[PDB]
Amino acid sequence: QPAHLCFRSFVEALKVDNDLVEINTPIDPNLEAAAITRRVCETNDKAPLFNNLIGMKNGLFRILGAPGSLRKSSADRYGRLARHLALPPTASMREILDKMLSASDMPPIPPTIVPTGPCKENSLDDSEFDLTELPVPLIHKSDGGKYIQTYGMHIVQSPDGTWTNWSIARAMVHDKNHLTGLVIPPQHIWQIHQMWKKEGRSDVPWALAFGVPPAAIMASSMPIPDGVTEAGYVGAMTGSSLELVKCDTNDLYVPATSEIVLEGTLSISETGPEGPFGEMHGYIFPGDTHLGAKYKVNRITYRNNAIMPMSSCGRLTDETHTMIGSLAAAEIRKLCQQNDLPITDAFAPFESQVTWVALRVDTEKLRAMKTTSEGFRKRVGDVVFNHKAGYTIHRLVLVGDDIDVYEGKDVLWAFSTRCRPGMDETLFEDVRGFPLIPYMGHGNGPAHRGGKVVSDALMPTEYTTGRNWEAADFNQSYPEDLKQKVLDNWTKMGFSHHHH
Amino acid sequence: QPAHLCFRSFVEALKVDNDLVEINTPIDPNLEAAAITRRVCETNDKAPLFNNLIGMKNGLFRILGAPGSLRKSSADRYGRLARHLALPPTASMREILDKMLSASDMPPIPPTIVPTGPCKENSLDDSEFDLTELPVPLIHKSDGGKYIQTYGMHIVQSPDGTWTNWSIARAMVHDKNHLTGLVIPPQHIWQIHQMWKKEGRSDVPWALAFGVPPAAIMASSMPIPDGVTEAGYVGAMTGSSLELVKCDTNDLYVPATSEIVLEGTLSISETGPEGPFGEMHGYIFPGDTHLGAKYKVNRITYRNNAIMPMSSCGRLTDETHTMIGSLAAAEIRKLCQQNDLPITDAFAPFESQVTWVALRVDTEKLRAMKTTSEGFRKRVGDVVFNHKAGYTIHRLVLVGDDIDVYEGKDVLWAFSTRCRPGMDETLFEDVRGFPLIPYMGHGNGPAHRGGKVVSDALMPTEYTTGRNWEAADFNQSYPEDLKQKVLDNWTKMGFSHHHH
């Protein structure tokens, strides 16, 4: 099966790419696996595959860390993401995000039901498993639980059957047969939960599939529109209908090649302690347990020699940056264009801890609008900050066409030199805020409201007559022939490879 | 003579350090020298010494580019700055800035007058030179003149004789015997000019010395206090009285080993076209000529085989970042401490185009103050933004003791995650602004006023009870023994030198 359609094949692809380290000696899921993975993420090393995890029994489980993290070379920096999508390993960020957006104006390709698959190779009923007995990792030393769920896909469906959502949200072990996890507005798992709670009749049928098709976990991490079933979006993106099998204990459908499947319910009434967790912005606040949603597990099914993917998230760079930020930026780009805003590109700079998105403006189109910074900033911020795709993003930076928004150095240069603090900004206090950012949930103001800004790094003439500067750089401040002469003579003179 | 006391010796030191490329074939001062230098600065390469400059006659002149720019390795990143100061080439930024601040509570060591020196080896009177005939560089293709002066020291003295100031300010050739240049408030060359203009009797006696003692050019780039003669500050810093010789045509004194000396006057009445110039923030606005101050040159004296230092300034990284930003930050650190503010460190992040300064706070001392963010931000911003040392800086970022302000990644992390836009900031509109920043002089508001902000990246408990988080990083989220085990086993497992 292709790597983008089968997690087991994706692991082989990473090996084939010389992007895997297999560790066959015993590794402790209590911190050691996650520490190794953390170190990998902070240094852009090869992904670790822990084949001998202390506490693994009856095939549950191996761990793959850092599945969507960065490679060291520039040329295949994003190669792990490209391997989620059947793209060449040298694919650019633009190409990855375009692939992720491509299904937005295609007909869905609904999934195909098949009678069985590898995820049915083994099973454990409610008398045979105990989640406290599995080698679930402690990912950070102060975490409030062992976070089994950092890179699986929750599956929930609307009461009326018309929308089946796939998404990543964290969850930790509560006891032998329950998890607790984050289920917060405006996320689709929360929106569907609310539908069930208003109906009031039953708990939500649920499945959590780990080691799903890589193309599916990418969509699971992306804020595609309300009401859109991710399976059909992934089908359209990949050009193939995804093969799904029915759960044994409910009528939800999981990818046939899922490594591990939990089947059960998401309660409409119960909660339990959840968190704290070392999170995407780089922090844990020890002891800050909150209540979270409570999941009951009724059945486990799994592949022979099952592999659990794990995100050891925190400071740069891991899945919470490469996937959450970039995929939100992609959706924001489209949202802006659909609102008739002249945005060509969007990216969440890693340097901002993916709390900013830089929006590249087609300034020819901007000039034709005959508008001003105040007006344009307000329009852009209303569109983005009032939409779910803008939820995680607290600062938008508008830049003109000379800036490559995928290059954080250039975004920072533009922001720092072209946006006058205060005057060239509009603050938004009456929008949904993202509480996970420390300055929100642990800050001086309301955890759930405000704290957002549009920072206009467009220069005045970009609205009127056109760019009126040249950069004081090698590229722009010397003629072509001279630049070429310098480059041609560079090593000859005494001064100091793309792949590497 | 020691490298920090003699520019010719400094050039030898760079050679000895394997930090020089001598170019002995013809190089054009029309753009080519500066393009090579620009490329060096953008790639942290070796400094270029142009020994065969097209248009050099009768010993005027060779060029050294990139005299204060960065080296590629991390271990001796700041080695060129260390070589200005007699510090080991591995000196940290903290050590360099402490050296630069050390003379602030020492008695000055006034200079020593000597009868002659190398700067007297050759002379040209007013009938023998023509500044349009010298190999003065065109540094950027759209510059409004050939900028002879990018790394020399202007020397002017108060009318009463009590203060002799040394400073860097740009100047370009106007005609055979005049320059134009920037002379703007609140700079000391401007303050002294104003004294002469109010006296109204004569033009200002002036000298411009190129290739001065490196320790002197560092002080020339630093906003030491009003009224303080840089020569005595440099004497105290180095522990040695600087040797100066008298000008021939006026009673000012220049370093004995200066490579090139211009003697003349700075007019109290005349101006001429000045600029545009590709500047420290990375931009030129072609055609934006302004009037500038006008200098008359009466005499040139120079060393045999004179060398002109040149800054090919613009985008990162050159002298305008390494020296202007860092030396302003140093002075701001001291200013804050002298105002009883609990600041331990200050640095202008390169990523901010040296328009921010990050201030590291001793949060134990902060807690004892029993204050709030609003109050503290206002206090800090009043101190800094009302002082000349804060002139160039438009954003102050307050960070706690876990952040190394010399590491821009960590400043950006703290800013992005700990400072809520708007609420955690105080804007300052009624302070002097720095017009050279594009969003000031070419922006939407007053070029000379406002546009400043204090951004508080201290978290709430840093004011009260103490830090209440741990980072989600390898360092903080795993115990010491485990971290060490991981590191010890890193290469054994399959994963991937300080000097490199």
Ligand SMILES: Cc1cc2c3c(c1C)C(C)(C)C[C@H]1C=C(c4ccccc4)[C@]4(C(=O)NC(=O)N=C4N2C[C@H](O)[C@H](O)[C@H](O)COP(=O)(O)O)N31
């Ligand atoms: C790639 C990835 C995504 C997420 C997470 C993680 C990884 C690795 C971990 C490591 C588990 C960290 C936490 C931290 C998380 C977090 C919480 C809120 C917002 C963003 C992140 C969270 C989480 O617990 N809760 C959450 O509501 N969304 C999460 N997302 C984002 C989420 O997958 C996207 O937003 C997506 O669009 C959802 O789908 P839909 O609702 O649009 O169908 N989660």
Ligand SMILES: Cc1cc2c3c(c1C)C(C)(C)C[C@H]1C=C(c4ccccc4)[C@]4(C(=O)NC(=O)N=C4N2C[C@H](O)[C@H](O)[C@H](O)COP(=O)(O)O)N31
């Ligand atoms: C290291 C360096 C410093 C400066 C410059 C340059 C280099 C290489 C060039 C490349 C020529 C670019 C321009 C760009 C410049 C610029 C203009 C205004 C502020 C900052 C920079 C300027 C300039 O034209 N005018 C100016 O008033 N100050 C300059 N300084 C800063 C100045 O040396 C310090 O501020 C110092 O503290 C002065 O001494 P004092 O007055 O305190 O005694 N100049």
Ligand SMILES: [K+]
């Ligand atoms: K999703």
Ligand SMILES: [K+]
């Ligand atoms: K602007």
Ligand SMILES: [K+]
């Ligand atoms: K000075």
Ligand SMILES: [K+]
């Ligand atoms: K704050």
Ligand SMILES: [Mn+2]
């Ligand atoms: Mn969804």
Ligand SMILES: [Mn+2]
């Ligand atoms: Mn001074």
